[PDB]
């Protein structure tokens, strides 16, 4: 572009401990400025999916046989030295030692940090950690198509003690007019709602589908599918007409305390991005017009990053590293993402204790052959039990006599002896209610000087907001 050759020397005269924030292909950049400063200079593109690195990587060297090109997504590259631009994913510098990180870092000319904004574990960790030699670098961090007009709606609610005399219905508890014969595309936040809804329509003799098996009704117009945000990611529909949007999705959250367990995490019904909401809108108005009935929920603004910033603290244990210190003093000068202070102060309080003392060796072994989706869980709880518990599975509102078991563990199942927990679960905090169970309290110092010490924070936050 006339703006690219504007951008590209914005970049190119960047001093080292230089950080720029870029908005707009965000692919061609890296090459406009490896062309500009030699060839046989380093540049590095931080990626957060392998298979976006692999794909980028392709399509460059075969675009630009001229320009020497290298990928990252596997084992360390030991002494690497690869003149091109490499494509690397976050994940593959996740594991590096700090120092090998800088030393690895400080040998680039240029760091692109891609796609910023998906604020991944692997993404959080590395920038809050590169941060740390940001002296020592030249960082830019990069960041982001209707084609005919959109009808739009505002559908409201469905309350108990319901008429709609077949003039409306009710789809995904969103009151809809039964004219809307089009091809319809309803987002849902659960995976149940989807099936649930879905039968729900068929009852009422419409062609209903859920998410190939859709392509056989994607085939027969008109056509409804109700489907979760997971169907925007590949799935193509048919010259779709319109799009109902509960303004909902299911997403991982933590709750903070100063009882413990301190953390508890577990998915939880939220309110879409502005950014979210665009892409279900963006669904329709592609190739024909779209109507676009959105419920009466009012959108975020940013993601909540909070359980990925949690995950991510995994990253620094080996290195004694702070990885929410890091990522609040990496971002209060890249000013990349918002702020929850009182979150940041609790999830930073908690990370000095994970790293406290060195991982007992049984729980880093564990930690890595395990399936555990939460790995750090049993880091955490380590402070107080080396052996992990099986909580009964709660299907509906009643606990079951089913356990989730993943590998490595060699866990008990609860009984009626609850585990001193740090880390928990939303369902495992449930089956403890449930059972009329208690969780223990802090056993030992570091653990009661943790709970003070949120205990403090939350005091001030509290009377913050009485007045």
Request: hydrophobic content about 35%.
């Amino acid at each position: 572009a006339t703006d690219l050759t504007e951008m590209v020397k914005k970049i190119t005269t960047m001093n080292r401990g230089e950080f720029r924030q870029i908005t707009l292909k965000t692919t061609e950049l890296p090459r406009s400025v490896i062309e500009e400063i030699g060839r046989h200079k380093r540049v590095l593109v931080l990626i957060p999916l392998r298979a976006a690195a692999e794909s980028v990587y392709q399509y460059m060297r075969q675009k630009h046989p001229s320009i020497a090109f290298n990928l990252r997504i596997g084992e360390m590259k030991e002494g690497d030295m690869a003149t091109g631009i490499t494509y690397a994913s976050y994940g593959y510098f996740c594991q590096m030692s700090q120092p090998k990180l800088r030393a690895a870092m400080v040998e680039y000319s240029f760091i692109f940090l891609d796609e910023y904004h998906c604020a991944t574990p692997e993404q959080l960790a590395i920038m809050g950690k590169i941060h740390r030699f940001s002296e020592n670098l030249r960082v830019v961090a990069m960041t982001a198509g209707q084609k005919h007009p959109i009808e739009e709606f505002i559908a409201p609610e469905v309350m108990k003690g319901e008429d709609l005399g077949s003039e409306y219905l009710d789809i995904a508890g969103l009151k809809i007019p039964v004219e809307e014969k089009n091809n319809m595309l309803v987002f849902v936040p659960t995976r149940n709602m989807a099936v649930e809804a879905a039968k729900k329509l068929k009852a009422k003799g419409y062609n209903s589908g859920y998410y190939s098996n859709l392509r056989v009704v994607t085939s027969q117009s008109p056509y409804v599918v109700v489907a979760t945000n997971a169907i925007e990611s590949g799935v193509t529909l048919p010259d779709l007409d319109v799009v109902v949007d509960t303004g909902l999705k299911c997403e991982k959250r933590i709750r903070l305390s100063p009882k413990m367990p301190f953390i508890v995490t577990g998915l939880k019904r939220m309110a879409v991005t502005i950014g979210e909401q665009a892409q279900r809108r963006g669904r329709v108005g592609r190739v024909k017009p779209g109507r676009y009935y959105r419920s009466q929920e009012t959108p975020v603004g940013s993601k909540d990053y909070h359980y990925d910033l949690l995950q991510a603290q995994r990253y620094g244990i080996e290195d004694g590293i702070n990885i929410t210190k890091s990522f609040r003093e990496m971002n209060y000068d890249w000013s990349l993402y918002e702020e929850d202070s009182l979150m940041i102060t609790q999830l930073e309080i908690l990370n000095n204790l994970l790293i406290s003392e060195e991982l007992p060796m049984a729980v880093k072994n564990i930690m890595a052959r395990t399936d555990h989706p939460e790995p750090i869980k049993l880091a955490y709880n380590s402070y107080e039990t080396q052996v992990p518990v099986l909580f009964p599975k709660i299907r509906n509102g009643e606990v079951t006599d089913t356990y989730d078991n993943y590998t490595f563990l060699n866990a008990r199942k609860l009984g009626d002896d609850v585990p001193p927990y740090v880390y928990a679960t939303e369902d495992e905090d449930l089956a403890v209610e449930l059972l009329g169970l208690d969780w223990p309290d802090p056993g030992n110092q570091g653990t009661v000087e943790a709970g003070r010490a949120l205990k403090q924070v939350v005091g001030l936050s509290t009377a913050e907001n009485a007045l």
